[PDB]
Amino acid sequence: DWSWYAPSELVAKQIANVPFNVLAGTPIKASVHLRYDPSLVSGLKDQLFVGNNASIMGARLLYLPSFGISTTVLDGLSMAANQLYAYVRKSNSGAKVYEAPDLMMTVLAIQEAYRVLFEIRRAITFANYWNFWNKYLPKQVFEQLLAIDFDDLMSNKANYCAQFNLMAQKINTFALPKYFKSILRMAYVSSNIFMDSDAVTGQMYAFVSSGYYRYSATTSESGTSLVYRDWPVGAAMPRKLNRLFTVLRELLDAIYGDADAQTMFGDIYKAFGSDGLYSIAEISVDETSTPVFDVDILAQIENCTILEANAGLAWTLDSCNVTQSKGQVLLWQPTGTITSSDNTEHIAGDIAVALGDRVLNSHIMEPQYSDVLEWTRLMATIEFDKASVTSSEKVTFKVTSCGAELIRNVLYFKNVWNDAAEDASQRVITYFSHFSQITVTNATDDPTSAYGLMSNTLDFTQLDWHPIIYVTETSVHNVANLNSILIGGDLKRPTVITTDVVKRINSAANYALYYSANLLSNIST
Amino acid sequence: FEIRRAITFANYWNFWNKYLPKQVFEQLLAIDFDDLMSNKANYCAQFNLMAQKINTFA
Amino acid sequence: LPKYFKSILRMAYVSSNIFMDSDAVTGQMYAFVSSGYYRYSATTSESGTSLVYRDWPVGAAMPRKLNRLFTVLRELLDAIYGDADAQTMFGDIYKAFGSDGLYSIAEISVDETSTPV
């Protein structure tokens, strides 16, 4: 009750009305007075440290589009395929012109095409959101959170805006059935930007594909299949849309290049109809979208699992394509490698890490089965291959299971300011900090030591709802002489899921996404 | 006019004629589609300007 | 920027239109054109923050394209934003003026077209 500390209705409004004159992005000029003996400290100028970092902007969730780890005539995705196929061939009098997968393959190709077009839409839409209190927003966010050359977009928006609308109309003439629950997800994920609070000043997360999928009936003997080419993205050069369309064109002109695929498009309109197909909407003259405050999404974050569990190491990732052997089974299971920051070839004296039995945290006291399902699949399981290794080896791994997204690596950014501008465009640097999900007591944000595992630049706490950080402690540091692990993150109502219990859920969850059958006990058009 | 035609028809798409959008332009009208797509908005606005100029010619 | 500065209204009107010397379109017409611009800089003079004027390369040299005109505005604003102090000021202003106590320039419609006055 403030009424207490107020001697006068006035005197209060008089010395309490402090200003909140710090726009998110400007530096937090906080200061720390300190006293020491200059003789015993390796060079430290004054005894007053003025702040200089701005509140964190947000975090980039580099994810690898997922269809659900599948390697069986039964692992869901294939089931789904047969499912769909049946409904198309259902009341069709032609002859077997392509097996179940051949079809399914085509569809997904179309889906993934949209996943690009959508991120593009997002780019154009958000170029209109400006807020007097977040100087990050307009520009800086694009360049760091979405990895899109803003300066380039600004110069040629109108053209891109109109180009998008054209593509949209093209895409809307491609046989993708509007009933695939999976689409709705991917659409929502790459269409918005989520806030971590109902406040605009707060930080915000964003999802960004780490690449795309091309269609190709030449790449593997077994038949048509989808190849994944990496988005040159890992903090390299913040890409311009120019490049983003050129790739979509490649993508669709590729789906169109297979006579078989087209013959399929046909079979689909035959069985679904004018409006049985997905349609992405154009963009008006006014359109402008806004950052959203979706709690469910934050939860997904907090709980998720980062593949690159610790940026202090070097990660790989191959065999991300999706193939099909003996005309009836779909295949996809990405595999990677883990080496040290020095010998990109060996692992040496560093330590590979992945989490198994993990935590699950609910911000609601009475979590319902519903809330679980949703807050889950964003978390995945990674299993090592050999049981043991040598410094001269590589540490190989597969992905047991995961959600529809699969978070690869995560970075957050802040502005650091500089009074003495030796330049001008050099007096407001935007720097990143790697976010490691697994770490060790006494780690440092210097790749340098700590068995090759970095700690996190402590300012990450600014992200209310950040992923659970699991820190391991040597039996030494532990008060119980038995080694274990410490938990980090705003816990409220926690609980634990088994490696196996998690796999089992996604195995299901993903299947649900591409599930069709529910259009087999009743027919349309 | 042929220019107007070019800009206008860049919006017609039909699920049953994969020729239409592109291919037709390149062969039937002899107009670089890939080029138009990249810079439509600019051409659209340019056309409208010219139109106003032409409409001031006797 | 506070919407109450009478000075703004002037400069706005002066560089927004083109004036005729008669009610006739055939007549001749005058126009106002800045000979340059002003940058913000807290480094240029010891005494403190200050505004520097760089000549528009204009005196019947090469008739400039907008490409160049935006690039300079970007410089201009990214410059005002570069002073931590200045931002801390922006804040103090919203605190005392409010959402609509500030100046606002209006966008341009699909139809918009202005006329010589």
XYZ file of C-alpha atoms in Angstrom, chain A residues 47-295:
249
model
C 36.723 3.049 -9.671
C 33.323 3.756 -11.229
C 31.733 1.485 -13.822
C 29.044 3.157 -15.893
C 26.595 0.819 -17.569
C 26.552 0.575 -21.310
C 24.477 -2.394 -22.490
C 20.827 -2.033 -23.515
C 18.063 -4.391 -22.436
C 18.229 -7.530 -24.546
C 16.316 -7.335 -27.795
C 15.289 -10.967 -28.069
C 16.392 -14.371 -29.329
C 16.699 -16.185 -32.652
C 15.401 -19.721 -32.700
C 17.219 -21.366 -35.584
C 15.097 -24.473 -36.213
C 15.253 -27.294 -38.729
C 11.805 -28.002 -40.259
C 10.688 -31.419 -39.019
C 8.309 -34.141 -40.135
C 8.875 -36.344 -37.130
C 11.779 -38.746 -36.914
C 10.564 -41.584 -39.115
C 12.329 -44.766 -40.209
C 9.607 -47.400 -40.386
C 6.807 -48.786 -42.517
C 4.874 -47.630 -39.453
C 6.515 -44.494 -38.069
C 3.464 -42.310 -38.621
C 4.553 -40.116 -41.500
C 4.377 -43.133 -43.823
C 1.038 -44.155 -42.325
C -0.215 -40.655 -43.054
C 1.031 -40.993 -46.616
C -0.854 -44.223 -47.339
C -3.806 -42.526 -45.662
C -3.829 -39.504 -47.962
C -3.039 -41.536 -51.083
C -6.012 -43.819 -50.431
C -8.437 -40.875 -50.380
C -7.117 -39.554 -53.673
C -7.025 -42.833 -55.556
C -10.351 -43.613 -53.795
C -12.945 -42.812 -56.483
C -10.405 -42.497 -59.343
C -10.656 -44.838 -62.367
C -7.134 -44.363 -63.778
C -4.311 -46.858 -63.229
C -1.586 -47.023 -60.538
C 0.686 -44.250 -61.891
C 2.648 -43.660 -58.661
C 2.962 -45.296 -55.245
C 1.851 -43.777 -51.911
C 5.121 -42.012 -51.028
C 5.617 -40.621 -54.565
C 2.485 -38.574 -53.857
C 3.103 -37.643 -50.237
C 6.567 -36.510 -51.350
C 5.048 -33.998 -53.755
C 2.720 -32.541 -51.144
C 5.399 -31.920 -48.529
C 7.451 -30.260 -51.237
C 4.611 -27.769 -51.650
C 4.335 -27.364 -47.895
C 7.978 -26.513 -47.429
C 7.708 -24.052 -50.295
C 5.125 -22.142 -48.278
C 7.363 -22.202 -45.182
C 9.572 -19.872 -47.168
C 6.880 -17.735 -48.742
C 5.484 -17.284 -45.228
C 8.716 -16.128 -43.631
C 8.814 -13.712 -46.569
C 5.297 -12.495 -45.849
C 6.295 -11.991 -42.237
C 9.228 -9.867 -43.384
C 7.096 -7.527 -45.495
C 4.291 -7.302 -42.947
C 6.464 -6.383 -39.973
C 8.270 -3.659 -41.854
C 5.350 -1.422 -40.878
C 5.499 -1.938 -37.086
C 7.150 0.944 -35.277
C 6.949 1.807 -31.616
C 8.320 4.943 -30.043
C 9.638 2.852 -27.163
C 11.638 0.142 -28.911
C 14.349 1.503 -31.201
C 15.325 -2.118 -31.891
C 12.107 -2.991 -33.675
C 11.901 -1.620 -37.175
C 15.537 -2.436 -38.245
C 17.862 -4.214 -35.785
C 15.297 -6.994 -35.159
C 15.178 -7.945 -38.819
C 18.934 -8.098 -39.159
C 19.420 -10.202 -36.028
C 16.192 -12.035 -35.209
C 15.025 -12.898 -38.728
C 18.301 -12.474 -40.587
C 16.900 -10.190 -43.294
C 18.726 -7.211 -44.853
C 16.537 -4.342 -43.756
C 18.375 -1.533 -45.548
C 17.768 -3.605 -48.733
C 14.085 -4.185 -48.039
C 13.425 -0.537 -47.314
C 14.909 0.488 -50.651
C 12.742 -1.973 -52.618
C 9.593 -2.783 -50.565
C 6.878 -1.926 -53.083
C 8.505 -4.328 -55.562
C 8.805 -7.147 -53.046
C 5.241 -6.475 -51.779
C 3.867 -6.826 -55.304
C 6.130 -9.804 -56.020
C 4.830 -11.590 -52.946
C 1.214 -11.114 -54.045
C 2.115 -12.601 -57.418
C 3.803 -15.651 -55.920
C 0.876 -16.099 -53.584
C -1.426 -16.418 -56.593
C 1.010 -18.966 -58.126
C 1.295 -21.016 -54.952
C -2.503 -21.013 -54.686
C -2.554 -22.990 -57.940
C -0.488 -25.804 -56.453
C -2.276 -28.947 -55.195
C -1.802 -28.637 -51.401
C -4.890 -29.862 -49.431
C -6.220 -27.314 -46.887
C -6.866 -29.982 -44.284
C -3.288 -30.811 -43.159
C -3.146 -29.750 -39.512
C 0.668 -29.491 -39.917
C 0.349 -26.456 -42.196
C -1.532 -24.349 -39.651
C 1.406 -24.856 -37.295
C 4.279 -23.957 -39.598
C 2.207 -20.987 -40.823
C 1.663 -19.539 -37.338
C 5.295 -20.179 -36.361
C 6.839 -18.307 -39.252
C 4.236 -15.566 -39.528
C 4.542 -13.805 -36.202
C 7.002 -12.648 -33.584
C 6.298 -13.408 -29.942
C 6.756 -11.115 -26.956
C 7.799 -12.456 -23.556
C 5.477 -9.985 -21.849
C 2.404 -7.842 -22.547
C 4.906 -4.972 -22.684
C 6.448 -3.664 -25.900
C 9.662 -2.801 -24.024
C 10.137 -6.447 -23.251
C 12.284 -8.802 -25.244
C 10.904 -11.054 -27.992
C 11.589 -14.440 -29.588
C 11.293 -15.382 -33.275
C 11.469 -18.644 -35.236
C 13.701 -18.948 -38.294
C 14.156 -21.903 -40.625
C 17.759 -23.044 -40.875
C 17.120 -24.005 -44.483
C 14.685 -25.309 -47.104
C 13.666 -28.441 -49.055
C 13.903 -28.985 -52.837
C 12.015 -31.610 -54.850
C 14.170 -33.922 -57.042
C 13.398 -37.135 -58.973
C 17.026 -37.438 -60.009
C 18.989 -37.180 -56.705
C 18.480 -40.781 -55.424
C 17.942 -44.045 -57.335
C 15.092 -45.215 -55.099
C 12.858 -42.410 -56.462
C 11.547 -38.860 -55.991
C 12.831 -37.257 -52.767
C 13.406 -33.980 -50.871
C 16.891 -32.518 -50.375
C 17.757 -30.046 -47.658
C 20.257 -27.299 -48.408
C 21.415 -25.171 -45.495
C 20.274 -21.548 -45.446
C 23.612 -19.985 -45.320
C 22.518 -18.605 -41.848
C 24.634 -19.356 -38.753
C 25.610 -15.721 -38.005
C 27.265 -15.322 -41.435
C 25.812 -12.590 -43.668
C 22.290 -11.204 -42.856
C 20.508 -12.092 -46.158
C 18.295 -9.899 -48.414
C 14.884 -10.941 -49.847
C 16.325 -10.750 -53.374
C 17.910 -14.127 -52.521
C 14.817 -15.411 -50.718
C 12.525 -15.222 -53.708
C 15.091 -16.576 -56.159
C 15.108 -19.717 -53.999
C 11.351 -20.050 -53.890
C 11.259 -19.765 -57.705
C 13.784 -22.619 -57.744
C 11.581 -24.520 -55.350
C 8.351 -24.318 -57.310
C 9.875 -24.513 -60.793
C 11.357 -27.724 -59.307
C 8.033 -29.212 -58.165
C 6.674 -28.381 -61.620
C 9.567 -30.118 -63.369
C 8.297 -33.628 -62.648
C 5.717 -34.739 -65.190
C 4.615 -37.281 -62.582
C 4.106 -34.621 -59.917
C 1.790 -32.631 -62.195
C -0.186 -35.707 -63.139
C -0.610 -35.827 -59.343
C -1.751 -32.232 -58.946
C -4.557 -33.262 -61.239
C -5.577 -36.328 -59.257
C -5.854 -34.050 -56.255
C -8.199 -31.378 -57.626
C -10.241 -34.386 -58.815
C -10.649 -35.530 -55.236
C -10.565 -32.296 -53.212
C -12.031 -29.462 -55.235
C -11.654 -25.749 -55.824
C -11.724 -25.031 -52.084
C -10.371 -28.306 -50.786
C -6.985 -26.652 -51.256
C -4.809 -24.431 -49.081
C -4.655 -20.756 -49.918
C -2.324 -18.080 -48.617
C -3.801 -14.587 -48.607
C -2.318 -11.597 -50.457
C -1.297 -8.440 -48.584
C -3.298 -5.214 -48.512
C -2.052 -1.660 -48.948
C -2.496 -1.145 -45.204
C -1.515 -4.496 -43.761
C 0.833 -4.463 -40.886
C 1.036 -7.239 -38.331
C 1.850 -7.009 -34.643
C 4.091 -8.830 -32.160
C 1.933 -11.315 -30.315
C 1.821 -12.356 -26.700
C 1.081 -16.076 -26.979
C 1.708 -17.747 -23.637
